[PDB]
Amino acid sequence: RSRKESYSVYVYKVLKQVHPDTGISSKAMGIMNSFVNDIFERIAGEASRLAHYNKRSTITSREIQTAVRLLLPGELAKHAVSEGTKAVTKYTSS
Template sequence: GEAEMSAESGRMRGHPSSSGDKKSKRKPKRKETYSVYIYKVLKQVHPDTGISSKAMSIMNSFVNDIFERLAVEASRLAQYNHRSTITSREVQTAVRLLLPGELAKHAVSEGTKAVTKYTSSK
């Protein structure tokens, strides 16, 4: 695929290449995406607007990219402090470092809200 490269893509998972058997049809590998969630958010902000599969693929790549950047930064922060756990504190700091101004402020408040909601539901 174009932009959908995953860590799993280059690796074979215990399926020996059956050269003799020409009938065996391999089930295509399932792809996990954020499409459903991107669509739900789109409908919240623009109920009458649709999205092409190309645009959805781009949005999915965007979400994966930001996730990766935040994870790497949070991991680095934990390592600097000789910690083996990424907590909400590392994630929050990563957000503050990676996102510009107002975007970081909104992201931090949404994150805090989500963590509070999760903690109270337990």
């Protein structure tokens, strides 16, 4: 099937790591689904504009990292950058 895809399978996979026994209501799961579509578009739009700033025609991981630096308040940005860079580091070795 297809019709309407969403984040629900990843908001519940990531929730089962932080709190193995905690569930999530359909409304709250929908709210998380919506929230991720916010940050995705925000980071990707700032990254597209960043590519446009240094006149690149590609959004690389460097653009995404600089877009993450521009939005997260310090500690949030300092840990999100580490998450992204570790994921990219570990994905290039496989």
